[PDB]
Amino acid sequence: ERFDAFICYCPSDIQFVQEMIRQLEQTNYRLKLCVSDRDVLPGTCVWSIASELIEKRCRRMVVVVSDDYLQSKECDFQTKFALSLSPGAHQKRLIPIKYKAMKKEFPSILRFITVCDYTNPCTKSWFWTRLAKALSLP
Numbered sequence: 342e343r344f345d346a347f348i349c350y351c352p353s354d355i356q357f358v359q360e361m362i363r364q365l366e367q368t369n370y371r372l373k374l375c376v377s378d379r380d381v382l383p384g385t386c387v388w389s390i391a392s393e394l395i396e397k398r399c400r401r402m403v404v405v406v407s408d409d410y411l412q413s414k415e416c417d418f419q420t421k422f423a424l425s426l427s428p429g430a431h432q433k434r435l436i437p438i439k440y441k442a443m444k445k446e447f448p449s450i451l452r453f454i455t456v457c458d459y460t461n462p463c464t465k466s467w468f469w470t471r472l473a474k475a476l477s478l479p
Contacts, residue, residue, distance in 0.1 A: 344375040346436070346476045347391075347399035349419045353409035357440045357459075361403075361472075370473040375399050391419050396426055401476055404437045406456070408445045420451070430454045436475055 350358050358376055365372035375381070375394055382390075395402050402423040410416055420435075427434040430453065437451045440459035447456070457475075459468050 342398065343373075344380070344394070344399040345373045345401065347375040347395050347402045347419075348377065348405065349402060349416050349423070350377070350405035351407070351409045351413040351416055354405035354407050354440075357405050357438070361405075364469045365473055365476065370477070372473060372476050374403075387415060388418060391415075392422055395419065395423055400479070401433070402435055403472075403476075404435065404451070406437050406439050406443075406448060406451070407441050408443055411445060411448065420448070424450065433475065433478075436472070438472070 348358050348361065355376075355378060358374070362374060362376065364370075366374055375398070377391075381394070402419070404410070404416070404420055404423075423435045424430075435451070435454055436457060437448070437454060438457045438459065439447070442460060457468060457472055459465060
Protein backbone atom coordinates (compact mmCIF):
# COMPACT_ATOMS: atom_id res chain seq x y z
CA GLU A 342 0.00 0.00 0.00
CA ARG A 343 2.59 2.52 1.19
CA PHE A 344 6.07 2.26 -0.32
CA ASP A 345 9.60 3.54 0.10
CA ALA A 346 10.39 4.13 -3.58
CA PHE A 347 8.52 4.18 -6.88
CA ILE A 348 10.70 2.72 -9.64
CA CYS A 349 10.48 4.38 -13.06
CA TYR A 350 11.79 2.17 -15.85
CA CYS A 351 11.19 0.86 -19.36
CA PRO A 352 10.80 -2.83 -20.39
CA SER A 353 14.55 -3.06 -21.03
CA ASP A 354 15.52 -1.64 -17.62
CA ILE A 355 13.30 -4.03 -15.63
CA GLN A 356 16.26 -6.36 -15.07
CA PHE A 357 18.17 -3.77 -13.11
CA VAL A 358 14.87 -3.49 -11.25
CA GLN A 359 15.27 -7.23 -10.57
CA GLU A 360 18.78 -6.67 -9.24
CA MET A 361 17.28 -3.79 -7.24
CA ILE A 362 14.56 -6.07 -5.83
CA ARG A 363 17.25 -8.56 -4.81
CA GLN A 364 19.60 -6.00 -3.28
CA LEU A 365 17.13 -3.67 -1.52
CA GLU A 366 14.14 -5.89 -0.67
CA GLN A 367 15.68 -9.35 -0.25
CA THR A 368 18.49 -8.13 2.05
CA ASN A 369 18.84 -6.45 5.45
CA TYR A 370 17.73 -3.11 3.97
CA ARG A 371 14.07 -4.28 3.89
CA LEU A 372 13.06 -1.70 1.29
CA LYS A 373 9.64 -1.73 -0.39
CA LEU A 374 9.85 -0.97 -4.11
CA CYS A 375 6.73 -0.06 -6.11
CA VAL A 376 7.73 -1.87 -9.28
CA SER A 377 5.19 -0.99 -11.97
CA ASP A 378 4.86 -4.48 -13.48
CA ARG A 379 4.29 -5.95 -10.00
CA ASP A 380 2.54 -3.48 -7.68
CA VAL A 381 0.51 -1.37 -10.14
CA LEU A 382 -2.84 -3.10 -10.62
CA PRO A 383 -4.51 -3.29 -14.05
CA GLY A 384 -7.52 -1.08 -14.56
CA THR A 385 -5.81 2.03 -13.18
CA CYS A 386 -4.89 5.03 -15.30
CA VAL A 387 -1.24 4.86 -16.37
CA TRP A 388 -1.10 8.58 -15.52
CA SER A 389 -3.40 9.05 -12.52
CA ILE A 390 -2.26 5.97 -10.59
CA ALA A 391 1.40 6.85 -11.15
CA SER A 392 0.60 10.40 -10.03
CA GLU A 393 -1.06 9.31 -6.78
CA LEU A 394 1.63 6.70 -6.16
CA ILE A 395 4.48 9.20 -6.55
CA GLU A 396 2.63 11.98 -4.71
CA LYS A 397 0.93 10.21 -1.80
CA ARG A 398 2.08 6.58 -1.42
CA CYS A 399 5.80 6.40 -2.24
CA ARG A 400 8.31 8.58 -0.42
CA ARG A 401 10.88 8.70 -3.25
CA MET A 402 11.07 7.90 -6.95
CA VAL A 403 13.90 6.01 -8.65
CA VAL A 404 14.63 6.53 -12.36
CA VAL A 405 16.50 3.75 -14.17
CA VAL A 406 18.00 5.94 -16.89
CA SER A 407 19.15 4.40 -20.18
CA ASP A 408 18.86 4.83 -23.94
CA ASP A 409 15.70 2.70 -24.03
CA TYR A 410 14.47 4.94 -21.19
CA LEU A 411 14.76 8.01 -23.43
CA GLN A 412 12.91 6.12 -26.18
CA SER A 413 9.95 5.72 -23.81
CA LYS A 414 7.27 8.25 -22.89
CA GLU A 415 5.44 6.95 -19.81
CA CYS A 416 8.76 7.13 -17.97
CA ASP A 417 9.19 10.72 -19.13
CA PHE A 418 5.75 11.67 -17.81
CA GLN A 419 6.51 10.05 -14.45
CA THR A 420 9.94 11.71 -14.31
CA LYS A 421 8.54 15.17 -15.07
CA PHE A 422 5.84 14.54 -12.46
CA ALA A 423 8.53 13.72 -9.90
CA LEU A 424 10.41 16.95 -10.68
CA SER A 425 7.11 18.82 -10.60
CA LEU A 426 6.38 17.76 -7.01
CA SER A 427 9.74 18.78 -5.47
CA PRO A 428 11.21 21.16 -8.07
CA GLY A 429 14.80 22.13 -7.50
CA ALA A 430 15.36 18.79 -5.71
CA HIS A 431 14.86 20.37 -2.28
CA GLN A 432 13.31 17.19 -0.82
CA LYS A 433 15.72 14.58 -2.27
CA ARG A 434 12.67 12.89 -3.82
CA LEU A 435 14.12 11.93 -7.22
CA ILE A 436 17.02 9.46 -7.53
CA PRO A 437 18.31 8.97 -11.10
CA ILE A 438 20.34 5.79 -11.59
CA LYS A 439 22.85 5.07 -14.34
CA TYR A 440 23.58 1.34 -14.47
CA LYS A 441 24.64 0.78 -18.09
CA ALA A 442 27.02 2.28 -20.62
CA MET A 443 25.24 4.94 -22.68
CA LYS A 444 25.99 6.39 -26.10
CA LYS A 445 23.32 9.08 -25.75
CA GLU A 446 23.09 12.21 -23.63
CA PHE A 447 21.90 12.02 -20.04
CA PRO A 448 18.42 13.61 -19.59
CA SER A 449 19.09 17.35 -19.64
CA ILE A 450 16.19 17.98 -17.26
CA LEU A 451 17.84 15.74 -14.61
CA ARG A 452 21.26 17.35 -15.07
CA PHE A 453 21.50 19.00 -11.64
CA ILE A 454 20.58 16.04 -9.41
CA THR A 455 23.13 13.51 -8.17
CA VAL A 456 23.19 10.41 -10.38
CA CYS A 457 23.84 7.10 -8.63
CA ASP A 458 26.35 5.55 -11.03
CA TYR A 459 26.76 1.78 -11.39
CA THR A 460 29.14 2.10 -14.36
CA ASN A 461 32.24 3.40 -12.56
CA PRO A 462 34.30 0.39 -11.39
CA CYS A 463 35.99 2.38 -8.59
CA THR A 464 32.74 3.65 -7.01
CA LYS A 465 30.40 0.65 -7.39
CA SER A 466 31.22 -0.47 -3.83
CA TRP A 467 29.00 2.32 -2.44
CA PHE A 468 26.24 2.08 -5.07
CA TRP A 469 23.83 -0.14 -3.14
CA THR A 470 24.77 1.38 0.22
CA ARG A 471 24.02 4.89 -1.05
CA LEU A 472 20.80 3.83 -2.79
CA ALA A 473 19.46 1.97 0.24
CA LYS A 474 20.41 4.88 2.51
CA ALA A 475 18.70 7.38 0.20
CA LEU A 476 15.55 5.25 0.25
CA SER A 477 15.74 4.82 4.05
CA LEU A 478 15.17 8.42 5.16
CA PRO A 479 12.00 10.52 5.71
